[PDB]
Scaffold this motif. Structure first.
Motif, short mmCIF file in Angstrom:
data_model
loop_
_atom_site.label_atom_id
_atom_site.label_comp_id
_atom_site.label_asym_id
_atom_site.label_seq_id
_atom_site.Cartn_x
_atom_site.Cartn_y
_atom_site.Cartn_z
N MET K 13 12.07 -8.12 -15.05
CA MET K 13 12.82 -7.02 -14.47
C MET K 13 12.07 -6.31 -13.36
N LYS K 14 10.94 -6.85 -12.91
CA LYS K 14 10.16 -6.18 -11.88
C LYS K 14 11.00 -5.93 -10.64
N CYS K 15 11.81 -6.92 -10.24
CA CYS K 15 12.76 -6.66 -9.17
C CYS K 15 13.74 -5.57 -9.58
N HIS K 16 14.34 -5.71 -10.76
CA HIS K 16 15.33 -4.73 -11.19
C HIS K 16 14.70 -3.36 -11.36
N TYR K 29 18.28 -7.72 -7.67
CA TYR K 29 18.40 -9.13 -7.99
C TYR K 29 17.64 -9.96 -6.97
N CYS K 30 17.37 -11.21 -7.33
CA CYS K 30 16.58 -12.10 -6.50
C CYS K 30 17.51 -12.82 -5.53
N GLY N 1 17.97 -11.20 -13.31
CA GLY N 1 17.41 -11.44 -14.62
C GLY N 1 18.43 -11.95 -15.61
N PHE N 2 18.10 -11.87 -16.89
CA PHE N 2 19.00 -12.29 -17.96
C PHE N 2 19.41 -13.74 -17.79
N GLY N 3 18.57 -14.52 -17.13
CA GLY N 3 18.81 -15.93 -16.95
C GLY N 3 19.58 -16.31 -15.71
N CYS N 4 20.15 -15.35 -14.99
CA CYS N 4 20.89 -15.66 -13.77
C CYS N 4 19.86 -15.98 -12.70
N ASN N 5 19.47 -17.24 -12.62
CA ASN N 5 18.39 -17.66 -11.73
C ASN N 5 18.76 -18.93 -10.99
N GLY N 6 19.98 -18.99 -10.48
CA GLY N 6 20.41 -20.10 -9.68
C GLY N 6 20.31 -21.42 -10.40
N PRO N 7 19.93 -22.47 -9.67
CA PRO N 7 19.89 -23.80 -10.27
C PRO N 7 18.89 -23.91 -11.38
N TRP N 8 17.91 -23.02 -11.44
CA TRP N 8 16.91 -23.04 -12.49
C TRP N 8 17.33 -22.25 -13.71
N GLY N 33 26.62 -15.82 -6.60
CA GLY N 33 26.23 -17.20 -6.49
C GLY N 33 25.18 -17.62 -7.48
N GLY N 34 25.29 -17.17 -8.72
CA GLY N 34 24.36 -17.56 -9.76
C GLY N 34 23.07 -16.77 -9.80
N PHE N 35 23.05 -15.57 -9.24
CA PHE N 35 21.81 -14.80 -9.18
C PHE N 35 21.99 -13.35 -9.60
N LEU N 36 23.02 -13.02 -10.36
CA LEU N 36 23.14 -11.66 -10.88
C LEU N 36 23.91 -11.71 -12.18
N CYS N 37 23.40 -11.04 -13.20
CA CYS N 37 24.14 -10.96 -14.44
C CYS N 37 25.21 -9.89 -14.31
N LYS N 38 26.45 -10.31 -14.07
CA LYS N 38 27.57 -9.40 -13.92
C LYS N 38 28.34 -9.38 -15.23
N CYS N 39 28.54 -8.18 -15.76
CA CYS N 39 29.18 -8.00 -17.05
C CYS N 39 30.65 -7.67 -16.88
N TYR N 40 31.47 -8.22 -17.77
CA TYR N 40 32.90 -7.95 -17.75
C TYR N 40 33.44 -7.86 -19.18
#
Lengths: 40, 40, 40, 40, 40, 40, 40, 40, 40, 40, 40, 40, 40, 40, 40, 40, 40, 40, 40, 40, 40, 40, 40, 40, 40
Positions: K13-16, K29-30, N1-8, N33-40
Motif C-alpha cells: 500500500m506504499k503507493c496507496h 494505484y500503479c 493493490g489487493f492483487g490488481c497488478n495487471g498481467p502479474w 485496465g487491471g490495475f485498481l481494485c474497484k469495489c461494487y
C-alpha cells in the motif's frame, strides 16, 4: 541509472529527484519495465 | 560492460556516457534486465 | 568465462570482444545473471 | 571444481571445456554465483 | 574440509567425490564462498 | 559492514539487529547485491 | 584498502569511517565484490 | 538473512520455514530481487 | 525457493516439478517477478 | 521455465519449441507477463 | 517508487498510503503499467 | 519470442521482420498483450 | 513497434512520426488495442 | 493493490474479497485496465 | 498518443488540451474506440 | 478474477465454468470491457 | 475524458457532475458512442 | 471466450468456428459489444 | 470477424471483400450494430 | 466501411466523398441504420 | 450513467430503478440511442 | 453526415446550418429516416 | 432494458417474455424506436 | 432537429416550444413524416 | 422481435415466416412503424 535498476531498485527517489532537477518536469519514474529514469 | 552489471552495477553513468559518445544517441540504459548497455 | 564472473567481473569487453569474433554477432553480454558470455 | 572458484577463478575455460566433453552441451558457466560448473 | 579451502583449494574433486559417496547426490561444490563442501 | 559481505556473509542478523537499533526501522537487509546493510 | 579485503575483511568500519571523512558522503561499502572501498 | 542471499542462496527453506513460524503466514520468499525474506 | 531465483534461476523445473507434487496442480511458475514458486 | 523468465528471458524459443513438442499446438509464448510458458 | 515496481511490486500500500497523505486523494494505484504511483 | 516480451521488449522489429519472412504477410505485432509475435 | 506497446507505451509520437514518413498519411495511432502502429 | 497488478495478477480474489469487506458491495474487479481494485 | 490509450488512459485532458492548441477546435476526444486523439 | 483479465486473459472458461457453478446461469462472460466475470 | 471511456467507463458521474458545473446544464452523457462528455 | 475479447480480439473465427460446431447455427459473432460469442 | 468489430473496426473491407468472395453478393456490411459481417 | 459505423461514425464525408467518386451519384449516406455506405 | 452505456449496457435496471426514485416517474429507459438515462 | 445519424444524432443544427450555407435553402432536415442531410 | 437496446438488441424475447409476465398483456415490443420494452 | 427524429423522438415539445419562440406561431409539429420541425 | 427492428431490420422474412407459422395468417409485417411483428 538514477536508481532505475529493476527489482534491485530502492525507493530513493533518485529517478524522481533527478527528474525534478529539470524545468517542466514534476516527477519521474522507472520506465522500460523499471530500467530507465523517464522524466515527466 | 559499461557498468551494466545487474545488482552490482553502480550509477556511474558509464553506460549512459558511453552511449552519449555516439551521434544520434541522447542516452543509454541497462537493458536485458540490467545486463546490457543499450544506447538510444 | 570471457569475464562474465558476476560482481567480480571487470569491464574488459572480453565477453563483448569475444562475441565480436563471430560473424553475425555485433556484441555480447553477461547473461545468466552476469555469469555467461551470451553473444548476439 | 573445473575452475568455478568465485573471484579466484581464472578464465581457463576448464568449466566450459569440461562441459564440452559431454554430448548435448555446447558450453558451461560458473553458476551458483561463480561456484559451480553448470553445463548447458 | 574435502578441499573446500578458498583460493588454496585444488581441483581434487574431494568435495565432489565425497558428496558422490552419498545416495541422492550427484555432485558437490565449495559453497560459503569456497569454504564448505555442500552436497547436492 | 554489519555482516553484509556477499557470499561470505553469515546469518548473524548483524545487519538486521543493527538496523533494529534505529527508530522507525523494523528490519534490515543486505542491499547492493549483498554488500550493504540497508535499513528499513 | 580501508578494510575492503574480501572474505578476510573485518567489520572495522574503516571503509565506512574513511568514506565518512569526505563531505557529501554518509557511508561506504566494499564494492567490486568486497574489494574496493566505495564511498556514497 | 534467512538464506535470502541472491545467487549464493541455497534452497534451505530458511526463509520459508522462518516465515512459517508466524501466525497468518503460509510461506515466504526472497523478495527484493532475492535479498529479503518476505513473509506471506 | 524451488529454483525461483530471478535471473540466477536455472531451468531445473524444480518449481514445476515441486508444484506437480500436489494434487490439482498441473504445473508451476516463478511468479512475483521470478522469485516465488507459484503452483497452478 | 522453458525460458519464460521475464526481462532475463532470451529468445531461445525454448518455450515455443517445447510447446511445439505437443500435438495440437503450433507455438507457445511467455504468458503471465513473461513468466509462464503457455502453449497454443 | 512507492512500491510501483511492476511484477516485483508487493502489496505494501506504499503507493496507496503515500497518495492518502495528500488532501483530495482517497487512494492511489500503479499506473503506467504498474510503474508509477498515480494518486487519485 | 522475436522480441515480443512485454514491457521489456525493444523496438527491434524482430517480430515484424520475422513475420516479413513469410509470404502473404506484410508485418507483425506483439499480440497477446505484447507477448506473442502475431504475423499478418 | 514504433512505440505501440500497450500500457507501457510512451507518448513519443514514434508511431505518429513514423507514419508521417509515408506520403498520403497525416498521422498514425496504436490500433489493435494499443499494439500496432497503424498509419492513416 | 489487493492483487490488481495487471498481467502479474493472480486470481486470489484479494480484490474481490477485500471489496466484500464493505457493506453495500457484492464484489470487486480490477478496473483501470487491471490495475485498481474497484469495489461494487 | 495524447493519452488516448484505451482502458489505461487517464483523464489528463492531454487529448483535450492538445486539441485546444489548434484554432477552430474547442475540444478533443479519444476516438477509434479510445485510441486516437480526435480534435473537434 | 476467474480469468477476466483484459488482453492477458486466456480462454480457460474459468469465468464461464465458474458461472456455470450457479443455478439459473448457463454461462458467463468478461463484462466491464473484459475485466469482470459476469454470470448469466 | 470525464469518464467517457467506452466500455471501460465506470458510472462515476464524472461526465454528469462535470457538466453540472456549468450554468444552463442539468446533466451530461457519453456521446460519440460513449467517448465524449457532452453537456446538456 | 472463443476470441470475443473486444479490441484485443483477433479474426481467428474461434467464435464463428465454435458456433459452427452446433447444429442449427451457420455462424457466430462477438455480441455484447465484442465480448460474447453469440451463436446464430 | 472479417473486421466487424464495433468502434475498433478499421476500414479494411475485410467484411466487404469476404462477402465479395461469394456468388450473388455484391458487398457486405457490419450489421448487428457493427459486429457481424452480413453479406448482400 | 467508408465511415458508416453507427454511433462511432464521424462526419468525415468518407461515405459521401466515396459515393461522389462514381458517375451518376451526387452523394451518399449511412443506410442500414447507419451501417452501410449507400450511394445515390 | 445509470447503466445507459450503449451495447455494453447490462440489464441492471439501474436506469429504471434510478428513475423510479423520483415521484411522478414510473420507469426509465436508455434514450439518446442507449446512452442517456431518461426518466418517465 | 452533418449530424444526420439516426437516434445518435444530436441537435447541433449541423444539417440545418450546413444547408443554410447554400443559396436558395432556408433550412435542412434529416431525411431518409434520420440518416441524410436533405437541404430545402 | 429487457433487451430493447436498439441495433444491439438480440431476439431473446426478453421484452416479450417479460411483458407476458403481466396479466392482460399478450406480448411486448421495443417501442421508442427500439429502446423501450412496451407491453401490450 | 428540435426533437423531430422519427420513432426515436421523445415528447420533449422541443419542436413545439422552439416554434413557440416565433411570433405568429402557436405551435409546431414533426412534419415530413416525423423528421422536420414545422412551425405553425 | 422477429426482425421488426426499425431501420436496422433486415429483410429476413422472420416476421413474415413467423406469422406464417400460425393458421389463418398468410403473412406478417412490421407494424408500429417498423417495430412490431404484426401477423395477418
Amino acid at each position: 541509472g538514477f536508481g532505475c535498476n529493476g527489482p534491485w531498485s530502492e525507493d530513493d527517489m533518485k529517478c524522481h529527484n533527478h527528474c525534478k532537477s529539470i524545468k517542466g518536469y514534476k516527477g519521474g519514474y522507472c520506465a522500460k519495465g523499471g530500467f530507465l529514469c523517464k522524466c515527466y
